[PDB]
Amino acid sequence: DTTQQLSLLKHVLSEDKRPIAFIIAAGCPVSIRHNDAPLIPDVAGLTRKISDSFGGNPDSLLMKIIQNLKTTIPNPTIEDILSYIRLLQQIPMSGKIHDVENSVINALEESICELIEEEVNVDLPGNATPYHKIAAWINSINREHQVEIFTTNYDLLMEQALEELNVPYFDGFVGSKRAFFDIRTIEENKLPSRWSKLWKLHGSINWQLDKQTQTIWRGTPSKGCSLIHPSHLKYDKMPYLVMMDQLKLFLNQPSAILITCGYSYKDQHINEVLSQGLQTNPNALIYGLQYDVLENYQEAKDMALKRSNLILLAKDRAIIGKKEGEWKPDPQSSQDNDPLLFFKLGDFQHLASFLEEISQ
Amino acid sequence: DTTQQLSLLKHVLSEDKRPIAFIIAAGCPVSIRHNDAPLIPDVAGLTRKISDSFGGNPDSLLMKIIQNLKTTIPNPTIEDILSYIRLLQQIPMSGKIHDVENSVINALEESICELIEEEVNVDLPGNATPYHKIAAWINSINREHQVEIFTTNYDLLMEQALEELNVPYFDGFVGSKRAFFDIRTIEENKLPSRWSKLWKLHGSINWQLDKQTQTIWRGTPSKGCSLIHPSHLKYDKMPYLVMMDQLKLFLNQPSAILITCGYSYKDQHINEVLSQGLQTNPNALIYGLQYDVLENYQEAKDMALKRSNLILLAKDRAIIGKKEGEWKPDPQSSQDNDPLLFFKLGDFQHLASFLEEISQ
Amino acid sequence: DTTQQLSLLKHVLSEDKRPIAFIIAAGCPVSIRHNDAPLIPDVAGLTRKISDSFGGNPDSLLMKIIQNLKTTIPNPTIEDILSYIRLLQQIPMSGKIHDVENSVINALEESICELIEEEVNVDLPGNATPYHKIAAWINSINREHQVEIFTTNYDLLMEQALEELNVPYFDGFVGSKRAFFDIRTIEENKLPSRWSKLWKLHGSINWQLDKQTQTIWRGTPSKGCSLIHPSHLKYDKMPYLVMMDQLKLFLNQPSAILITCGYSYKDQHINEVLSQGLQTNPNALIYGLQYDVLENYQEAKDMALKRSNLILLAKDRAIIGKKEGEWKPDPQSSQDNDPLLFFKLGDFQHLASFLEEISQ
Amino acid sequence: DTTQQLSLLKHVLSEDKRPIAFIIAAGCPVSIRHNDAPLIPDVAGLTRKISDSFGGNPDSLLMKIIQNLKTTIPNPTIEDILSYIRLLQQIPMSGKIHDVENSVINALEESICELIEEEVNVDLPGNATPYHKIAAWINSINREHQVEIFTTNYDLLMEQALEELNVPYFDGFVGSKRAFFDIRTIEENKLPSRWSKLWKLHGSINWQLDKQTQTIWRGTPSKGCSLIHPSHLKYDKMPYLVMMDQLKLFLNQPSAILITCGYSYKDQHINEVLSQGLQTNPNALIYGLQYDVLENYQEAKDMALKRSNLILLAKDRAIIGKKEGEWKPDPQSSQDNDPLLFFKLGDFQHLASFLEEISQ
């Protein structure tokens, strides 16, 4: 598998007549090792650290909500929990469901948001991080089509790497003191070609909301961010639809390319927007790379089997245009014992190293 | 007032080098007289007829919700009620708020939907209805730019008038048996120029949902329609965002025109989308016409005072480019007693008559 | 005077085939009245408030430096004081001149910088400030040539007004977390035409310096800003030369316009750069407006008499192309007593009102 | 090493579709042998000859400044000394630091300037000097792109060689009696293509300043030159910024070439301007040649490792696009004893001989 797909990927990436896009999920931040431990424990960590923070006491409302959701959702996540409390606080839930916390739901969600901001407030150590390598690859060669990045994370690590290496980009906001979400440049879509475009689909930690005029602005991480939403907020104090429109518009461009690293296709909206974009333009390609085994990605299998221009690649098998194949007999593992054929190049560290090698 | 604004409106409408759009709200269906009574009692009717249907018994859940919402919302509407029950049923609301109806909320909302479908299932009597006059105006002269219609109503009266007079149009769906919501023609945006475009922002009664594949389709009015939503449904089994995108794209076209008849600017999403479109393109114009007095439209006043290309016209006063004016001294009323200066031409019947006169 | 010059100014400003620039000095912030007092006491205030802060004790080093400079400079300013301490700290000044403060010079300059940041850290009250009117004028009409602003102040009031009214602009820096001074866009000079350009010649309060890598970045006002320099810093951790190059390049454009409000032509570098630009392009025009009397502006008189395309206008007299004229006999003052002919329209409030009237 | 790099250099220099530039430092004047001694003892000579001129008496102010600077700067230079006295005389330094010389600092700096002018006032002996060979190469073949020379020296030897062989060039000044620094031709940048351009970044000995009008002019070497500054003078009576702008503008041209001979990269401003130019245009190339060993050039190593289009070549090793290589096994030295592999062609004499061979 390695030779042919790697060579084709090198040819398609090295060209400058095609757009290039990335999708960055929690896999990229967790791929950075710190003190022999993951830098950030991902979406699952933002769940069980929260669970352990409130202790084993069942009198706490959070644990009761957890055990209620296991009755319906076998594997609830922190995004679902945040959505559930946001739904509860949208109406005067004074019933027996929220009888214990007549008004402590707001305190609980504020505490959750504070803990999330505390945990996702880190910085890139040194200059050997994979984000620096990706930024170096982006700035290495001038390409006639812009490089776009879509991130579902809340961290500023990608921006830190882009700014350290002096890579210009436009994330949507314009201004210096309290940058306003400038809209008309977004659909004007004639910015200088050397600029990059970083879209934060799920918001970020530096976005804040002023309720006096009900307007959003990008600032600095302060005590309480009102745009930590995992795609759950009001209608268009909401830039989420604009970023989704930008992704859809990009996917409709001819000869489009896109790579997903660290994504597990567990979000319905992303999957359906990708399906609409792929069906709209048959020339669009997605070189999905999974760090986990293919057996654990059912939605990825459904997406690959329902579309023809989605070259899904996993650690063990692959789906190249609705047809499934496995690894051919090759000396992938030198050791005779346990001759597992694994695609070790799907890791974010290995992906960044590959991009650096292509840059050189 | 009458002469100058009417003459300017005649010039701008008679030209075929500018796009023309309409927004049709409950004012147009209520403007049709039937048995010396309104044909449909509008959004307020879909509220108090519902209230009277459940009787004066306070044990009913609907009345309890009504009196709960008056504690928060001084003037709750049927749209807000539908949204509130939809929010309640989105979570297992087994608390004291919904203790009376552990599972009767579904029955109550089904009954409400059935009554709504029963009341909004009528037909245009004769060929003298204003919709027929508007369709005749649309088909009278060939225009190089298409005529677009955005409707927040659920009725099929506009389609009935368009089909009776043989006016071709595209409402989004494609097919004959169970028309699927075709997307790619929508952003392809190169349909024949002689076709019209009717967008139903708030759905319609002939739209149905199949949960087996979770897909929407336009059919015939049957027992239970799942797309009666006043802009409250799932994410993109949802064409609402596509119609909103179409409205926004139209508003960005140069030298755009738009007329609101029967609209009270009481929906936040419509107002904010209109504001974004108007600020995006300064050439866009809105000739808002209000059947009610200007004093009862606070949102209209705010919209007119916050933008320069919104020529708001009311029964008594007007706001033409952020400046407010009143009716000049004219013999509007022949009778000496109560010399009220009222713009009687803002009614839907008078608007249709004016359009017919311009057509002739 | 009023009619002809005002009408010519209206014609030249209303056109969109010529570039427009502003120069904003302390006159604009002092023109805002607050509590029947100036909002900020200008460069003179940043001098005598400093003098009063250290008291009347002659043992203080600051007072000794003040009385030393009066021996050489009859009217020393805060800029000169800052330059003098910066020169002293550039070398190990252990002599009798700095014997009193062997190392307290750093503490004194840090205290001065802290007080300056404290005093210049304000916000625009309400929406009636002249900056809001100027921003409304800028965003009112689309012009094929960009509007440029050069500010010698440290305040963020202009940015506050621009962001409140949603006016896009580019101040040089690119990024979100710690915006780096992006250079290549600056001489690339092909940004979208709808964007404005705000150049801070004398730095600002949100600019900070990292000595670990010795790089500047635009952030938030923190404890200690290292780029408060009134044009006195290191060679090209210095964007001053880049902004000067941008001003010089703009002045060389054909049919250029520029207006100075609140400037007294007391800075040699600004005057000489303006002279070089004006001589380079004879088509460049400067409509200098002085709030003070012409007798108090010797450098302005020299500049006007040494160049032909500098239409200097003062409160009493004017110099239009090397020729000096006075106010013709007109009923400028209604009162018979003290018939002073004063151009009251040179004030920043009146200038903003005039710009708003031209916009309407 | 020799064959491949020499052949590539021959190809790139022989083409006339690319700009060519030189940077000339003290290595070129010292490379000329006179009486079995260096013609000029370089920057180090302009330091220790000055030190020996004032004798071993510690009562002299110059020696005291020398020993003061060794406390801070391990290797102070004559440029730093001149800057330090210029800083001292910029303020009334009447303290204990300058107590010994209340006003003798001016006399000391005048004596230093007189000695510098005396030592750098020589002429090219004969017609066999390398400058004559370089001028012959420049005039040998007509090139569509001009040849530019940037010199950090004060001598007129390059001009002497250019004038002896009748090579036209433009050094910035225009006129015959007292040539004024003409600016508008400099950015006009449409001089005849056959003319060369010689830029003196660090001034020269024939530049003089008239304080009556405070203007600079190129004349003849007289008693006291006021523009001997090693890049340390007033703001824009200063052409230094204009020459820097010219260098930066040249470096931004596509397919630019540049060769540094005799430069040790010990000036921060040159290095940072070169870095900005190289990053601005990735097509720009620098074929740095060092007469000294690579181990003695730390700034050169940092510059080479921080950029990809800087082909640094030294006597022993090389850095070609961020990658370091050494000399391959070749019979560089015929003698078996001490088989040192040294690039003897990096000398200025050998460089001129190589250029002459390429010309033939």
In one-letter notation, the amino acid at residue A38 is P
Looking at beta carbons, which residues of chain B come within 8 Å of A184?
A: 279-280
For residue B216, give the H/E element and its range: strand B215-218
Find where tokens 């929010």 sit.
B87
Alpha carbons within 13 angstroms on the beta-carbon side of residue C110 total: 7
Q: How far apart are CA C254 and CA C228, in angstroms?
A: 33
Residues 6+ apart with CB under 8 A from B99: A95, A96
Judged by CB atoms closer than 8 Å, whether chains meet at C174 and A168 is answered as yes
Q: How far apart are CA C194 and CA C138, in angstroms?
A: 10
Give the sign of the dihedral formed by CA B161, CA B164, CA B168, CA B174. positive
Looking at beta carbons, which residues of chain A come within 8 Å of B84?
A: 91
Residues 6+ apart with CB under 8 A from A12: A18, A257, A285
A194 touching D (Cβ < 8 Å) = no
Q: How far apart are CA A284 and CA A307, in angstroms?
A: 11
Find where tokens 């000794």 sit.
C64
Residues 6+ apart with CB under 8 A from D176: none
Q: For chain B, first and last CA: distance in Å?
A: 23
Q: In the PDB record, what is the listed experimental method?
A: cryo-EM
Helix-strand-coil split of chain D, %, nearest 5: 40, 15, 45
Residues 6+ apart with CB under 8 A from B251: B258, B273, B274, B277, B278, B280, B281, B284
Residues 6+ apart with CB under 8 A from A200: A151, A171, A243
Judged by CB atoms closer than 8 Å, whether chains meet at B280 and A187 is answered as yes
Q: How far apart are CA D40 and CA D29, in angstroms?
A: 6
Q: How far apart are CA C338 and CA D262, in angstroms?
A: 74
Q: How far apart are CA B335 and CA A319, in angstroms?
A: 82
Minimal Cβ distance to D91: which of C87, C92, C235: C87
Judged by CB atoms closer than 8 Å, whether chains meet at C95 and D93 is answered as yes
Phi/psi for A104 (5° steps) reads -80, -5
User: Nearest-CA neighbor of C122 among C35, C231, C216, C51?
Assistant: C35
Please state, in angstroms and as integers, the Cα–Cα distance from residue B108 to each residue in B64, B221, B225, B227, following that order. 13, 20, 15, 17
Looking at beta carbons, which residues of chain A come within 8 Å of D308?
A: 140
Q: What is the dihedral of CA D308, D312, D313, D314, to 10 degrees?
A: -130
In DSSP notation, B28-96 reads HHHTSEETTEESS-HHHHHHHHHHHHT-S-TTSHHHHHHHHHHHH-SS--HHHHHHHHHHHHTTT--SG
D282 touching A (Cβ < 8 Å) = yes
A187 touching B (Cβ < 8 Å) = yes
Q: For chain A, give the number of residues.
A: 360
Instruction: Give alpha helix (H) positions in chain B.
Output: 2-14, 27-30, 42-53, 61-72, 78-89, 104-119, 130-140, 157-164, 184-188, 240-251, 268-280, 298-305, 348-359
Q: Residue B215 forms beta bridges with which residues?
A: B210
C183 touching D (Cβ < 8 Å) = yes
Helix/strand number for chain D, H first, E second: 13, 14
Residues 6+ apart with CB under 8 A from C108: C61, C62, C85, C101
Q: How far apart are CA D95 and CA C148, in angstroms?
A: 47
Please state, in angstroms and as integers, the Cα–Cα distance from residue C80 to each residue in B186, C111, C251, following that order. 66, 16, 28
Any idea what DSSP says for residue C90? T
D213 touching C (Cβ < 8 Å) = no
Contact between chain B and chain D (3 or more Cβ pairs less than 8 Å apart)? no
Give the sign of the dihedral formed by CA C242, CA C247, CA C248, CA C252. positive
Q: Is C211 left (phi over 0), alpha (psi -120 to 50) or beta?
A: alpha
Judged by CB atoms closer than 8 Å, whether chains meet at C192 and A194 is answered as no
Sheet with B179-181, edge to edge strand ranges: B173-174, B179-181, B215-218, B207-210
Q: How far apart are CA A164 and CA D276, in angstroms?
A: 16
D254 touching A (Cβ < 8 Å) = no
In DSSP notation, A101-159 reads -SSHHHHHHHHHHHHHHHHT-----SS-SHHHHHHHHHHHS--SS-EEEEE----SHHH
Contacts of residues B173-180 at CB distance under 8 Å and 24 or more positions apart, as own/partner, are: B173/B217, B173/B218, B175/B217, B178/B217, B178/B218, B178/B219, B179/B217, B179/B218, B179/B219, B180/B215, B180/B217
Judged by CB atoms closer than 8 Å, whether chains meet at A177 and C190 is answered as no
Q: How far apart are CA C110 and CA C4, in angstroms?
A: 51
B254 touching C (Cβ < 8 Å) = no
Judged by CB atoms closer than 8 Å, whether chains meet at C90 and D93 is answered as no
D185 touching C (Cβ < 8 Å) = no
Output the six-digit token pair for C195: 């964007």
C-beta of residue A294 within 8 angstroms of C-beta of residue A316: yes
Looking at beta carbons, which residues of chain A come within 8 Å of D279?
A: 166
Q: How far apart are CA A319 and CA A308, in angstroms?
A: 9
Any idea what DSSP says for residue A40? S
Q: In Å, how far from its chain's centre is CA D167?
A: 20
Listed resolution, Å: 3.2
Looking at beta carbons, which residues of chain A come within 8 Å of B276?
A: 183, 236
A94 vs chain B: nearest CA distance in angstroms? 6
Residues 6+ apart with CB under 8 A from B116: B46, B154, B228
